[PDB]
Amino acid sequence: RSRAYTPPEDLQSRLESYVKEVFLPSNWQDISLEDSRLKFNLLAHLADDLGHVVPNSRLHQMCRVRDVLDFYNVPIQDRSKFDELSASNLPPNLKITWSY
Amino acid sequence: PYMTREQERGHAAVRRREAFEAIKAAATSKFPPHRFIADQLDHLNVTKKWS
Amino acid sequence: VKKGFRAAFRFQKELERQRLLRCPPPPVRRSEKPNWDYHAEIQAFGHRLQENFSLDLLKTAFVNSCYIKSEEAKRQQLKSNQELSEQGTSFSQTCLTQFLEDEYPDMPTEGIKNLVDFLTGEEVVCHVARNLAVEQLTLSEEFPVPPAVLQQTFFAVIGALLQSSGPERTALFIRDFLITQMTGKELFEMWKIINPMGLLVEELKKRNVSAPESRLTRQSGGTTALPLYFVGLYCDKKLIAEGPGETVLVAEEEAARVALRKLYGFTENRRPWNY
Amino acid sequence: LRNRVTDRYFRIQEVLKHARHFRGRKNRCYRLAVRTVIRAFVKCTKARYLKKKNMRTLWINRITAASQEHGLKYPALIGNLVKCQVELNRKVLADLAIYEPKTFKSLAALASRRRHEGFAAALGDGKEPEGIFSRVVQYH
Amino acid sequence: TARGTPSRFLASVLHNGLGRYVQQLQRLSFSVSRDGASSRGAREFVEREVIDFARRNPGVVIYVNSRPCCVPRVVAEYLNGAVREESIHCKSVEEISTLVQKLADQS
Amino acid sequence: IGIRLTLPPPKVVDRWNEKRAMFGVYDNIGILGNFEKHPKELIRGPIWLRGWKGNELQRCIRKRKMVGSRMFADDLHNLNKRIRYLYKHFNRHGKFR
């Protein structure tokens, strides 16, 4: 259970496969998620699979399948600032310590 | 003098009128400034921390 | 008892400051205080001076022989410094004699030896190496770093710059740090002599000029506790130098010194060092 | 006392670090040290005007002395150096007077030469050739 | 005032412009609270500006300590062994950048 | 030198006390409990200032008429003199009129 997310490379076909398995026509990226059961099944399958869930703050924002598609291909990367600074390719005269 | 008083009359009335319409216009265009969402929310950053 | 915390904290730290001024602690070396990364700071010492070193070689330039011995005294409960310091002081002696033979061709070689033995003295080199952060990087036994040791490490750093990047860059290094130490200093503040009159006499024999007559040019307050004399020194009734003094002997010796500065090109008006 | 003042040693000490070098009780007793410290700061700012003034009269004393060594007087030197378009100022002329007295002697020679051309030019009046050092360089 | 204060003459450290120019600033020591409202502008300075600054002059070795402080400081140390401790307490990133460049530029 | 030499004992504050954790609960008992109570019926204090705010002359008048009959003798007397003083102050003294 770690908030790091790295989007898959077969995400188009997986997501499309889930859209067919919840249903199916062409132009499937413009399917409205107005039906609430359809949205719950689609995002519940994706959360079960990818381990990455659409938050409550964004859950109303996807009204098409394309928006879920655009959500599941942002890399949410989670580590401490000590691990972000020390990995940002420091010059040889910066030294950072964490008295924590 | 370069002119008589009859010659100078109204030779600069337009520029004087425009100048005062500018003074008048800056006087009658006074109002409170716009208030923004970004400023009010930007006060939340006083408790921005590291992770 | 006034409630609160902030005035008691401020007052607590002012008491700490008066404790540090009344009884200050003995100075600890810099590597035994917070914020020290030895490797990072050797690299910084390289980039600071605007040259490159082979870093291991500069690392051995800071490692003394006293430090290894007291370190192995501490083991029972490293290349030394001496090779690089030998090369560095040999080279800096010959390059200082190159510069000072080129820009002062009339000097006696006794004078060049005393100039070079000033610019590589303990006072000069220890004054330079405490402001280039050499002392902070010296691995020595005792603190503060004793002046013979620090002289040795400074010339070790010159030896490491020599093996790093050749004789020309070290020539510019020595030019920019040792030669600039003779700016604003008179010749006989560096090359001390006794009996300048005899020295001036011998030098005038070497140019095949006659012995100079010392000859009182100007004076004032002769019968007071504050006289002033200007003794001149003539050669075939043309003066070579004239100097003031509180007595006549003082002014004559000093006129001898003015003449010696004038023979050797080391006047106060000489063409400055071209950097 | 609901909230009385805790941080009062430091207000006093803000004043008294400026008084530590006075005499008498002005160096210790805040009530006396405040009047003297205020009064010291007022003098300290009005003394900027007098620093500038006294430097200038010091320079005029030194230029006066050094130019009297060459027979000139001070108005003659300054006037007839302006008239040569040598716009050196008093600080520099006083420093040349002390440290470079041959340059100062040659400036006194240039100013007395210009002074004589002023005399000879304003004596033989009418259309004549101007003086050599009397010529000016026109800037456009 | 001038009679209360000490004075000195205008100087360099080792004839600092004659031969070559040497940056007189050896170490900076930032100390920055992780959670703490006073070292906010310090935090945004370490994240944005300190790496660029550390590259623009490599003769300066920079230590960011990041302990729980209640006032953040920077401690400039100089080649002649002077130490200037200045606070970056409740300063913006731009104000800290001008302060750090101020400490860099001087001796 | 009225400044203390040692810094005082630390002030240990429990932010997750019972009082602090439950502060503010039932301030909206009116607007989401069908208006059966007002929030001013939540406050406890003197009986003459539960859900009432006044300046000092009004606090004294209200205290006298609400509880003054069972006040102690010289407290009642002090309070009568305070109303008499504060009367003569608010009504006859000040800058603005």
Ligand SMILES: [Mg+2]
């Ligand atoms: Mg004036």
